[PDB]
Amino acid sequence: KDFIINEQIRAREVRLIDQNGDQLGIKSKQEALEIAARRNLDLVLVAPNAKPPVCRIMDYGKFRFEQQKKEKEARK
RNA sequence: CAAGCUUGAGUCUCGUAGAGGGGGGUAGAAUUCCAGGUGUAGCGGUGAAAUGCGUAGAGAUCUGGAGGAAUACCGGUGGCG
């Protein structure tokens, strides 16, 4: 569920996937953070144990809200 | 029982203070909501949290509008009944 995002990420390099599924390739964490920032989105570590770790560009708050919404609705 | 008397009690005149009552108008602050601009990943809450809300862009900021409810300061062993 919970993913670490943005500056919480410690990986030197990550494989980057953008908000639409475009495979941006291997990028330094710094460049990945720049791309996320220019798009006003978050850099989310979706696959911490992949080699190299996989990050997805997305709105973390919107993603998390929808996930919690889904869980709650299906149980009431 | 009858006549009175004016101090009790009323009536008259002119003023005073008051959130006293009833009706009708109207005002500026705020909350919530609606519509937009800027902005971007959090907001919110607690002892700590989680539920909740936010990338269908929240919260924060600026703008316009709707609506209801109550009237900060004045304000006080102040006032009225």
UniProtKB/Swiss-Prot annotation:
It comes from the Bacteria. It is found in: Cytoplasm. Belongs to the IF-3 family. IF-3 binds to the 30S ribosomal subunit and shifts the equilibrium between 70S ribosomes and their 50S and 30S subunits in favor of the free subunits, thus enhancing the availability of 30S subunits on which protein synthesis initiation begins. Monomer. This is Translation initiation factor IF-3. It comes from Geobacillus stearothermophilus (Bacillus stearothermophilus). The chain holds residues 3 to 78 of 172 of the full protein.
